[PDB]
Amino acid sequence: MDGVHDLAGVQGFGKVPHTVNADIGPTFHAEWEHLPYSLMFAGVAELGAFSVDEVRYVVERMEPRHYMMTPYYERYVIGVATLMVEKGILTQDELESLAGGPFPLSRPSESEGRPAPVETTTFEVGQRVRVRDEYVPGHIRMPAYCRGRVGTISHRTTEKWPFPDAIGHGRNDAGEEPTYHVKFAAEELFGSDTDGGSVVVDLFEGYLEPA
C-alpha cells in the first residue's frame, strides 16, 4: 500500500529528536502506553483474532492526516481497536461509550490482499536480483524506494514465514517463504541525492526476480 507510512526517502523533515546516549526516560512515559502492545499480543496469541501483520496493515490504513498527527503508541491503540471491531469482537459504540467520547478508527481496507506468489526463485548469496515492478494496494513489506531496483543477495534466511501480503489481510493462502537481505548501492536508490553507502532491505522471496 503506497501510504504515507512509507516514509523512507521522503524529504523535508527536520532533525531527529535525539543526540546519542541522551536520556530517553522510562520505557513508558504514560500509564496507558503498555496497553497497545500488550493487547496486540492478547489478540494474536490468546484470542487468535489476527496476525502481527494485520496490526501493521491496520495502522497503514489510518486516514493519512490522522496517521501523520498521531503519536506512535496511540496509532497502535487505534489499530488494535479497529481490528477488534472488524473481527466482530468489539463495537465502536462500546469503545466510544467507555472512552467518553470519539474514538475514530482506521479506514476500511480497499484490497482483499493477494496470495503468496505461485512462482518464485530460490536465490543464492551473491546473486543479482531485481525487486519486482509491482503495485500492491494492500499490505506489502517492500518500501517503495526499492521497487524495480537491483541489488545483490547477502543472506537467504534459514527459516520461512507467511507472505505478508496475504497474512496481513487474514487470508488462508500466505504459505511460507524465506526472505533475502538484498544490498543496494545508495546511488541505485537515490541517484546522486544521498550521502550513504549501501542499504540492505530484507525482502520476501515473492518480491524478487533474477536481474
Q: Catalytic residue numbers?
A: 56, 72, 76
Taking CB under 5 A as the criterion, which residues in 14-73 touch Cl ion?
31-32
Smallest distance, Å, CB 210 to another protein? 20
Interaction of residue 118 with another protein, rule CB under 8 A:
no
CA distance 170 to 172: 7
The single residue among 74, 173, 188, 209 that binds Cl ion, judged by CB under 5 A, is: 209
Binding mask 58-97 for another protein (x = CB under 8 A): -x---x-xx-xx-xx-x--xx-xx--x----xx---xxx-
Taking CB under 5 A as the criterion, which residues in 109-148 touch Mg ion?
144
Cβ–Cβ < 8 Å for 58, 75? no
Q: Report long-range pairs for 115-118 (Cβ below 8 Å, ≥24 apart).
A: 115/163, 115/165, 115/166, 115/171, 115/173, 115/174, 115/175, 116/162, 116/163, 116/165, 116/166, 116/173, 116/174, 116/175, 116/176, 116/177, 116/206, 117/163, 117/205, 117/206
Smallest distance, Å, CB 63 to Cl ion? 25
Taking CB under 8 A as the criterion, which residues in 32-61 touch another protein?
32-39, 41-42, 46-47, 56, 59
121 binds, among Mg ion, another protein, Cl ion, none (CB under 5 to 8 A by kind): Cl ion
Residues that bind Cl ion in the complex, under the rule CB under 5 A = 31-32, 121, 191-192, 209
